[PDB]
Design an enzyme around this catalytic site. Structure first.
Site, PDB file in Angstrom:
ATOM      1  N   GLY A   1       0.835  -1.430  -0.128  1.00 27.54           N
ATOM      2  CA  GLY A   1      -0.192   0.019   0.361  1.00 27.54           C
ATOM      3  C   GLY A   1       0.588   1.167  -0.499  1.00 27.54           C
ATOM      4  O   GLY A   1       0.346   2.675   0.144  1.00 27.54           O
TER       5      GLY A   1
ATOM      6  N   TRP B   1       6.407  -5.198   0.765  1.00 22.37           N
ATOM      7  CA  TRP B   1       4.934  -5.768   0.107  1.00 22.37           C
ATOM      8  C   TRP B   1       4.838  -7.022  -0.159  1.00 22.37           C
ATOM      9  O   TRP B   1       4.179  -7.707  -1.232  1.00 22.37           O
ATOM     10  CB  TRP B   1       4.063  -4.926  -1.304  1.00 22.37           C
ATOM     11  CG  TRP B   1       5.192  -4.424  -2.082  1.00 22.37           C
ATOM     12  CD1 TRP B   1       5.468  -3.276  -1.619  1.00 22.37           C
ATOM     13  CD2 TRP B   1       5.384  -4.753  -3.016  1.00 22.37           C
ATOM     14  NE1 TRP B   1       6.438  -2.593  -3.084  1.00 22.37           N
ATOM     15  CE2 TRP B   1       6.260  -3.880  -3.925  1.00 22.37           C
ATOM     16  CE3 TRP B   1       5.108  -5.765  -3.958  1.00 22.37           C
ATOM     17  CZ2 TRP B   1       6.698  -3.851  -4.782  1.00 22.37           C
ATOM     18  CZ3 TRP B   1       5.800  -5.874  -5.584  1.00 22.37           C
ATOM     19  CH2 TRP B   1       5.993  -4.651  -6.035  1.00 22.37           C
TER      20      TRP B   1
ATOM     21  N   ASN C   1       9.001   1.334  -1.643  1.00 22.20           N
ATOM     22  CA  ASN C   1       9.583   3.121  -1.361  1.00 22.20           C
ATOM     23  C   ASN C   1       8.147   3.892  -0.647  1.00 22.20           C
ATOM     24  O   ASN C   1       7.503   3.500   0.258  1.00 22.20           O
ATOM     25  CB  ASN C   1       8.454   3.921  -2.935  1.00 22.20           C
ATOM     26  CG  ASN C   1       6.556   3.742  -2.984  1.00 22.20           C
ATOM     27  OD1 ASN C   1       5.917   2.564  -3.235  1.00 22.20           O
ATOM     28  ND2 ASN C   1       6.439   4.992  -3.016  1.00 22.20           N
TER      29      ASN C   1
ATOM     30  N   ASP D   1      10.051   6.013  -7.306  1.00 18.88           N
ATOM     31  CA  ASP D   1       8.578   4.576  -7.143  1.00 18.88           C
ATOM     32  C   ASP D   1      10.165   3.153  -7.192  1.00 18.88           C
ATOM     33  O   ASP D   1       9.415   2.155  -7.250  1.00 18.88           O
ATOM     34  CB  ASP D   1       8.243   4.154  -7.689  1.00 18.88           C
ATOM     35  CG  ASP D   1       6.992   2.828  -6.796  1.00 18.88           C
ATOM     36  OD1 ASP D   1       6.920   3.115  -5.372  1.00 18.88           O
ATOM     37  OD2 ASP D   1       6.089   2.587  -7.701  1.00 18.88           O
TER      38      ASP D   1
HETATM   39  O1  PQQ Z   1       4.305   0.088  -2.699  1.00 13.23           O
HETATM   40  C1  PQQ Z   1       3.958  -0.783  -2.715  1.00 13.23           C
HETATM   41  O2  PQQ Z   1       3.300  -1.089  -1.332  1.00 13.23           O
HETATM   42  C2  PQQ Z   1       3.741  -1.482  -3.685  1.00 13.23           C
HETATM   43  C3  PQQ Z   1       3.159  -2.392  -3.538  1.00 13.23           C
HETATM   44  C4  PQQ Z   1       3.036  -3.569  -5.074  1.00 13.23           C
HETATM   45  C5  PQQ Z   1       2.051  -4.682  -4.935  1.00 13.23           C
HETATM   46  O3  PQQ Z   1       1.761  -4.980  -3.799  1.00 13.23           O
HETATM   47  O4  PQQ Z   1       1.995  -5.642  -5.382  1.00 13.23           O
HETATM   48  C6  PQQ Z   1       3.214  -2.748  -6.226  1.00 13.23           C
HETATM   49  C7  PQQ Z   1       4.593  -1.863  -6.338  1.00 13.23           C
HETATM   50  N1  PQQ Z   1       4.063  -1.091  -4.859  1.00 13.23           N
HETATM   51  C8  PQQ Z   1       4.679  -0.986  -6.694  1.00 13.23           C
HETATM   52  O5  PQQ Z   1       5.035   0.011  -6.887  1.00 13.23           O
HETATM   53  C9  PQQ Z   1       5.152  -1.645  -8.490  1.00 13.23           C
HETATM   54  O6  PQQ Z   1       5.626  -1.165  -9.534  1.00 13.23           O
HETATM   55  C10 PQQ Z   1       4.290  -2.844  -8.496  1.00 13.23           C
HETATM   56  C11 PQQ Z   1       3.800  -3.712  -9.439  1.00 13.23           C
HETATM   57  C12 PQQ Z   1       2.789  -5.350  -9.432  1.00 13.23           C
HETATM   58  C13 PQQ Z   1       3.098  -6.082 -10.554  1.00 13.23           C
HETATM   59  O7  PQQ Z   1       2.375  -6.968  -9.201  1.00 13.23           O
HETATM   60  O8  PQQ Z   1       3.154  -6.407 -10.886  1.00 13.23           O
HETATM   61  N2  PQQ Z   1       3.368  -4.712  -8.216  1.00 13.23           N
HETATM   62  C14 PQQ Z   1       3.517  -3.532  -7.551  1.00 13.23           C
HETATM   63 PR    PR Z   2       5.614   1.252  -4.641  1.00  9.47          PR
END
Ligand code: PQQ
Ligand code: PR
Ligand code: CA
Length: 562
Positions: free
Chosen positions: A170, A236, A254, A296
């Site tokens: 999140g 995460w 991040n 990020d």
């Molecule tokens: O900052 C966060 O809490 C968070 C969570 C997630 C997530 O839970 O999958 C992603 C991201 N950031 C993120 O920055 C990101 O590029 C991302 C790509 C993906 C995916 O499964 O393709 N999840 C997430």
């Molecule tokens: Pr993120």
């Protein structure tokens, strides 16, 4: 019927895989060598299983296999138990999700954990759920955090020393990242550790919360004002565990918001690897891959233990391929930097790393504050926000000594803008456009020698790579592509040796095991994740891929192994 000793034995028991990662350390190496480069042409599908429900989007789980049963998850917080030999469904559990779940990046789930007679997973509304392995009925369920504040869970949980451990997701919503441990048999909370400096951690006894130290010592050290109350750093992706040091190794997301001008300071422990004591959740050391992040560049990417010899002395190391483009090798006993080097061909935000592993920043690559205007001026940066590598795990081959990294080559234009926190709303303050660096490829599967710091081979893909990797004693590397293939490569040379078109982009990390004297390989298919949310050129490149949701199982017939 899964004990802690059995978990610690993976991957040595050929008939089962009871961990995310094929072993608690996450090396994703199988010691099976029935299947090898000389006979992989004989690998073929033996059955498939459709997730159904008119619910597709990204499918990221790694299956676990125990007693001839496969346990896995699907999009929209679903769990499946499937017979490993026939593909027949044993049972399915569909979480009742509210309409206001708040995932940033698709409705994905990366897998279950197993312990005793239970199956565990985290839900997109930030619950931790235990299911009976034989019936799929709920045994217990606990709220880990409040989904209305932007929390979700997308990672597979893990078992350490008999304790069930989950993070949360999140950061794009300004949640406070935290890791927590539970009694697997009844869901009683054991401890909780925030990943943002200034928040109190706790142990729990007799249902009472007992203070157990402020993360980072005191609030306000590397954050201004009350920005640390919404600081992100969400752990995460889950983590892995090293039995030699008895440390849990967990990366963190991040810092929030994306507009770094609102939060001067290193912003601990965002964009970091943490090592924690599984007894009580105390942080023993940290390594921050991107202090004061502006792009990020989540620091969640897995930190994989491996051992090697240096001038006669044994080095207990761990490696990680970061969103920010650097491949890091740390001493896992104390978190100290050993070496760090690019694993992509272009990095603009830093010119190198100092002797402690901290970046040497190129400040022209940080987007400026908006000041008087609604948006600041855009700057070009590589890697893009989606990173040199994102969630999808790399693998370590013990025979070649190499890591196999699913990487991507792309930059971006990025700019900043004002942003106020509102509970439950996105908390960005930045926008971007992804710009691939090359006309004919984005994904690059790379073999990296973590001791010499050299790339040994590379294999290009038109679409980005977004799937986990498996490697085996048979000199094989497997990974999926968005074009829909499960592909295999020679682990020494990178030459493609086999592939199969599953019909939807493959994100799942492949797994392999032995049953009735035959080697099986399985992967989850179904295109999704963050890449379809990108507009512009990336969208043009991936426009013709179709969604899916299917478990694929392949085998090498015994009579064709020789
Ligand atoms: O900052 C966060 O809490 C968070 C969570 C997630 C997530 O839970 O999958 C992603 C991201 N950031 C993120 O920055 C990101 O590029 C991302 C790509 C993906 C995916 O499964 O393709 N999840 C997430
Ligand atoms: Pr993120
Ligand atoms: Ca313990």
């Amino acid at each position: 019927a899964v004990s802690n000793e059995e978990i610690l034995q993976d991957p040595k028991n050929p008939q089962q895989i009871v961990t995310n990662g094929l072993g608690v350390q996450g090396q994703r190496y199988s010691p099976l060598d029935l299947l090898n480069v000389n006979n992989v042409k004989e690998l073929r599908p033996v059955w498939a299983f459709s997730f159904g429900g008119e619910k597709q989007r990204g499918q990221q789980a790694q299956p676990l296999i125990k007693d001839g049963v496969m346990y896995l998850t699907g999009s929209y917080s679903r769990v499946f138990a499937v017979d490993a030999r026939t593909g027949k469904k044993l049972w399915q559990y569909d979480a009742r999700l509210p309409d206001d779940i708040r995932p940033c990046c698709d409705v994905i789930n990366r897998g279950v954990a197993l312990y005793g007679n239970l199956v565990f997973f985290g839900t997109l509304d930030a619950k931790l759920v235990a299911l009976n392995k034989d019936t799929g009925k709920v045994v217990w369920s606990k709220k880990v955090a409040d989904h209305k504040e932007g929390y979700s869970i997308s990672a597979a949980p893990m078992i350490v020393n008999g304790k069930l451990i989950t993070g949360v997701a999140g950061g794009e919503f300004g949640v406070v990242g935290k890791i927590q441990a539970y009694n697997p048999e009844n869901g009683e909370l054991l401890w909780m550790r925030p990943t943002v400096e200034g928040h109190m951690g706790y142990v729990y006894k007799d249902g009472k919360a007992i203070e157990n130290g402020i993360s980072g010592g005191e609030a306000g050290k590397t954050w201004p004002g009350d920005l640390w109350k919404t600081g992100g750093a969400a752990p995460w992706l889950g983590g892995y565990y090293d039995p030699e040091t008895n440390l849990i190794l967990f990366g963190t997301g991040n810092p929030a918001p994306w507009n770094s001008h609102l939060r001067p300071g290193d912003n601990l422990y965002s964009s970091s690897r943490l090592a924690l004591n599984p007894d009580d959740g105390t942080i023993k050391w940290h390594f921050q891959s991107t202090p004061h992040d502006g792009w990020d560049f989540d620091g969640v990417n897995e930190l994989i233990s491996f051992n090697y010899k240096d001038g006669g002395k044994e080095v207990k190391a761990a490696a990680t391929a970061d969103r920010n483009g650097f491949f890091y090798v740390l001493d896992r006993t104390n978190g100290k930097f050993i070496r760090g080097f690019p694993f992509v061909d272009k990095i603009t935000w830093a010119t190198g790393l100092d002797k402690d592993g901290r970046p040497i920043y190129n400040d022209a690559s940080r987007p400026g504050a908006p000041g008087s205007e609604a948006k600041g001026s855009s700057v070009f940066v590589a890697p893009a926000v989606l990173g040199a590598k994102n969630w999808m795990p790399m693998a370590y081959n013990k025979d070649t000594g190499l890591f196999y990294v699913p990487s991507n080559e792309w930059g971006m234009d990025i700019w900043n803008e004002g942003i106020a926190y509102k509970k439950g709303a996105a908390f960005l303050g930045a926008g971007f456009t992804i710009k691939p660096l090359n006309e004919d490829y984005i994904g690059v599967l790379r073999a990296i020698d973590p001791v010499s710091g050299k790339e040994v081979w590379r294999h290009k893909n038109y679409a980005p790579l977004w799937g986990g990797v498996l490697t085996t004693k048979g000199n094989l590397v497997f990974t999926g592509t968005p074009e829909g293939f499960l592909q295999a490569f020679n682990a020494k040379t990178g030459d493609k040796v086999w592939e199969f078109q599953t019909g939807s982009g493959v994100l799942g990390s492949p797994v392999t095991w032995e049953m009735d004297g035959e080697q099986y390989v399985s992967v989850v298919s179904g295109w999704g994740g963050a890449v379809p949310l990108a507009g512009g050129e990336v969208a043009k490149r991936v426009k013709d891929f179709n969604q899916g949701g299917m478990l694929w199982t392949f085998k090498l017939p015994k009579q064709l192994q020789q």
